[PDB]
Amino acid sequence: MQLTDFKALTFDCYGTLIDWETGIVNALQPLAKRTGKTFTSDELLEVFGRNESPQQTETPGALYQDILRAVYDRIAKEWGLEPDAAEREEFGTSVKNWPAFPDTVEALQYLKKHYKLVILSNIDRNEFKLSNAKLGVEFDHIITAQDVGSYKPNPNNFTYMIDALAKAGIEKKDILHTAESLYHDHIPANDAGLVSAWIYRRHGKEGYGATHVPSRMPNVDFRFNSMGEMAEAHKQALKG
């Protein structure tokens, strides 16, 4: 079991490559300021996660901005605030402001030299196009919840991706599914028979943050605390 055995990295984006937690914390600041309260980042992410998961209907909405706008309305209500139309508009379009993790671009640019790179996203294609401009590489394949007809962890998202990659020349055993979310990615990757690389982005933090809690702990074949550390492990494997 070696990193170099694989031909394609199939990525989660939001939480693995894009730091969506920092993006959400930043995007909630205008609304939070009106409460007069003081929130930690963990507290804001708890509020976001408790109010976003209900919006994850079985059939995906066409536009992720509609989820964010509905979340804004829910959070304004929870905080005893009246919603503001301009704040809602800015919050709903905020994916374009969500930053990459500081290590992501250099890691992706290295791994692009050696692997086919694929995206599996629950956030829609045009939002991901905005994030992609910050990620420093072109992705060979991009699969969204709108393509599949469901959100991960639905098994259809993984069979859709596996079939797409097979048609592109990548056998299932040559896929390494690389992602932070045990719930969204590694439980269904396990069930689908994929090998997993767990990027534990919250390794130095408490809890799951903006990420849904998993029903079980999945098996993972590789563990890294960052994308940069995955790239370093590949470099070390090639050196012997």
Curated annotation (Swiss-Prot):
Primary location group:
periplasm
| Classification via Pfam families | Hydrolase
Q: What is its EC number?
A: 3.5.-.-
The record's note on quaternary structure and interaction partners says: Monomer.
Q: Which family does it belong to?
A: Belongs to the HAD-like hydrolase superfamily.
Q: What is this protein for, i.e. what is its function?
A: Catalyzes the hydrolysis of the toxic natural product azetidine-2-carboxylate (an L-proline analog) by opening the azetidine ring to produce 2-hydroxy-4-aminobutanoate. Is thus involved in the detoxification of this compound but also in the degradation pathway of azetidine-2-carboxylate that allows Pseudomonas sp. A2C to grow on azetidine-2-carboxylate as the sole source of nitrogen. Does not show any detectable 2-haloacid dehalogenase activity with either (R)- or (S)-2-chloropropionate as the substrate, and is not able to hydrolyze L-proline.
**Name this protein carries in UniProt:** L-azetidine-2-carboxylate hydrolase
